[PDB]
Each structure stands twice: as structure tokens, then as C-alpha cells.
Structure 1
Amino acid sequence: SYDRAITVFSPDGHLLQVEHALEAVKKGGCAVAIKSSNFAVLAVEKKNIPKLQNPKTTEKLIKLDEHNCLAFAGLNADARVLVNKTRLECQRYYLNMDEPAPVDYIAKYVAKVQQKFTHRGGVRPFGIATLIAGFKNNKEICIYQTEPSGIYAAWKAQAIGKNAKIVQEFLEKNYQENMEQKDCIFLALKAIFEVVELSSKNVEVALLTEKDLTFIEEQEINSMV
């Protein structure tokens, strides 16, 4: 199977392997992205065995370049290799144009790479869905969600992973435009906590600004009323 078609059309018209990659995404952990005026908030579930597993080693929120960040859901090794490819292309664009890569360009590149992997021979589809967040050429911030199918789309707020529909509904019935940083962080917390149990250790949340992607300390996450 060096050059063979793993992804092919079914009798109905679907690509079965893309659907199976979507199932693999559905097994993955829950991640949430919310936008604001000039900053974003990404919050992702954590699952660590107490007292034995290193909390810091698992890292689902990743910095891609100066001004882009990623939060995936699905297979972890697939996510690591895709993130390394994305970082390589970010630096390649910044070498080939002498500007940082905007969020829309790199989201399109990740979607194109996933489409290529669903279409070339002797290659398996990526079993991961991503929520990239970043800034545009005109300094405007936005969030792009990308499926295993290679289709991308921009969102004001979005959720991926296990029980994504419930969090999407909660974000729909609670999102407002241009909310403060504390309000955005609290909304992200109470949205992602609708499916994962109420505890401080089962989540890691970060805030993306033009300067850097800061991580919220566990003390600040605690005392959420």
C-alpha cells in the first residue's frame, strides 16, 4: 500500500475513512474557543492521573508562531505531526514574505494539508480537528475551525471534541460581542464545564493577545464561584 487508495467513495457517495476520522475526533477531548474585540480565549479539557502523571507534559493548547495558537481534538500523535508541519509552514511564510503568517492563511494551509492527506495514495486521513486562533494582516483577530474533511470555517465561538453539540448550544445561548477578559474567561469556563466535571484540574485555559499567549494560573482558575 505504498501508493494505494485508502480513501474511496462508498456506494452512497461518502468517503468512509473521513467519517472514521470524524469518529476519532469525537473520541477526542473537548476544546472551546471564544473571540473578543482584540483577544481570544482557548480552553481545553485535561485528563491526568493524580500523583503519577506529569501535569505539564500534556499540552493541547500550542503556540504556532508569534501570533497564532492551536487547540486540537482527536489523535495526539497526528496532532503533534500536523502542528510541527504548521510551525514549519509559518516560518517558511515568514521567510518567503518577511511578514508573520496571518491566521487565515495558515488555517487554509492546514485545511489543504488535511485534504491532501484524504486524497493522495498510500496515506491515512488525519484523525484530528483543530481550532486555530490568531490575527490577520489588518490586525483583526479571528478563530478558524478545521475538520478532518479539509473544510475550514471562521467562527465567533466554537467547540470541538466529545459532546461538542452541547457546548456549541451553550455558546450559542450565552455569547455576546466585545466582552471583557474576565467575562470571556468565565464564559469559556462555564461553557466547557457543561460536559466535563466541575473541578479546577480538568481544564487548561489560555488568553491570546497581540503580545503573547498567556496561560491562566491554576489559582486564578480556582475560585470560579
Structure 2
Amino acid sequence: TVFSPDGHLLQVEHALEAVKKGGCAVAIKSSNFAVLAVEKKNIPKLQNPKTTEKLIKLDEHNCLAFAGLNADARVLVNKTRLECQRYYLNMDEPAPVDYIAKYVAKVQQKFTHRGGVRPFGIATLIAGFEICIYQTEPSGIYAAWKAQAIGKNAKIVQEFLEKNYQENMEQKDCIFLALKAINVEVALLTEKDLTFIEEQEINSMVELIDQERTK
């Protein structure tokens, strides 16, 4: 849109807020593994109501999570899919998370820049491979992180996450910190392969965090 006398952009600063009020998500990182975990609320009766919240797989060796508008997220993500396929076609080799973070950032920016288009309402974060995570704000900036949290009240999750942070850890145990920061949308990027973690599998852990907080 247009600069205010301060030089801050309004549509962007407004645009962030939809993320500043949306379902939380986080990623925890390490060598060959990373735990991406979000949170989405749904009506209990309807088990199928959000098979869509689930963390997206842009490529077999790539994975994404987001917070903000879903209606806009489906768009951005599809553009990302078409683009990883484009790079993977023109190179015959897979897209590195760097280049795709760069592409997506170029998009979100572009809409903020060129006229005729409403700015995005979402904040993205991406895991890929060693393994390294890139968060992308609505402004069009992006940044590497060791750990981060998008969503409503991201600061409590994240600054409490700083209190608990530790770098490389276990394939399973690194999961627990995501919960300690964070029903749950768990997925694990590992072996350059995103995976939809079994529902029952975490249930044991789902018990302890429920009770270590109690006892």
C-alpha cells in the first residue's frame, strides 16, 4: 500500500496480526532431525474436520508449517509446490531449503510491493536439509533459527522455550521439548523425509506431560 510518515507500512503491520492471533506452531532443530509441532482446535465429534491442519510436505525432503489464514496458506503452499517442482525440473535435483525459503520470501514480499494485491495474512516456517530451519514473516523477511514459534502468544511459548533450550538431542526426546513449549499436530522431519507421527505413539508421553505438570 503506502508509507505512513513514520515510514512503517500499514497493510503489513496489520497483516501480521492475523498471525499474532492464530494457532500456535513451533519447530525444534538438530543435525539430521527436527520436530515440527503445531496446534489446531476442532469440534470433537468431527475427526475428519481438520486433516488439513496437518503439517504440509512440499517435497519428500522438505516440510512446512504455518500459522494465520488457511485460505491464504493453501495458495502460498501450492505456489511453493509448483516451485519446488520447477526447480527440481530445471536442475534435475531437489530444492534446498535455502532456495525455497528465498522463493517464498520473494513472493510474500512481492505482494506487499506490487500493486493490485492484498498482502498475505500468514507466517510460515520451514524445515529441510545439514538440516536447517527458516521462518518467513508476512513482511517478506526470512531468517534461520535454531528454534522458533509462530502463532498466537508465540512469545510465551518461545521465551519459555529459551529457558529450556538444548541443541542436539534424541530422535524421540527432542520431541518432548516441542510439547513442553506447546490437541497436538505433531510431525517429525527426519532422514530428509517428513512424517505424520502416529497418534497412539505419543500417548504415553501425552500422559507424562499431563502429570509431570501435576506431579
Cα distance, 1:97 vs structure 2: 0.9
Query: For residues 115 and 58 of structure 1, what CA distance do their matches in structure 2 show?
Result: 26
In structure 2, stretches of 5+ residues that fail to align are 207-215
Correspondence 1:128-143 to 2 at 5 A: 128-135=122-129, 140-143=130-133
In structure 1, stretches of 5+ residues that fail to align are 1-6, 193-201
Cα distance, 1:56 vs structure 2: 4.8
Query: For residues 166 and 56 of structure 1, what CA distance do their matches in structure 2 show?
Result: 25
2:38 alignment partner, SS class: strand
Show CA shifts across 1:160-208 (max 9, x none): 000000111122111112100121111111111xxxxxxxxx1111111
Partner of residue 197, structure 1 = none
Partner of residue 126, structure 1 = 120
How many aligned residue pairs are there? 206
Match of 2:16 among 22, 30, 50: 22
Query: For residues 204 and 44 of structure 1, what CA distance do their matches in structure 2 show?
Result: 5
Cα distance, 1:55 vs structure 2: 4.5
Show CA shifts across 1:109-167 (max 9, x none): 111100000011110111000011001xxxx1000000000000000110000000011
Query: For residues 14 and 60 of structure 1, what CA distance do their matches in structure 2 show?
Result: 34
Contact 1:60/1:72 (8 A) holds in 2: no
Partner of residue 109, structure 1 = 103
Counting aligned pairs with the same residue, the percent is 100
Query: For residues 182 and 53 of structure 1, what CA distance do their matches in structure 2 show?
Result: 26
Cα distance, 1:58 vs structure 2: 2.4
Show CA shifts across 1:86-115 (max 9, x none): 000000000111110000100011111000
Instruction: Report which stretch shifted further, 141-150 or 175-184.
Output: 175-184
TM-score when normalising by structure 2: 0.92
Instruction: Report which stretch shifted further, 215-224 or 38-47.
Output: 215-224
CA root-mean-square deviation: 1.2
Cα distance, 1:53 vs structure 2: 5.2
Cα distance, 1:18 vs structure 2: 0.2
Instruction: Report which stretch shifted further, 105-114 or 176-185.
Output: 176-185
Partner of residue 191, structure 1 = 181
Contact 1:66/1:100 (8 A) holds in 2: no
**Superposition misfits of 4+ residues, deviation over 2 angstroms:** 55-60
Query: For residues 2 and 54 of structure 2, what CA distance do their matches in structure 1 show?
Result: 31
2:205 alignment partner, SS class: coil
2:172 alignment partner, SS class: helix
1:64 alignment partner, SS class: strand
1:222 alignment partner, SS class: helix
Show CA shifts across 1:51-104 (max 9, x none): 135245322410001211110000101100000000000000001111100001
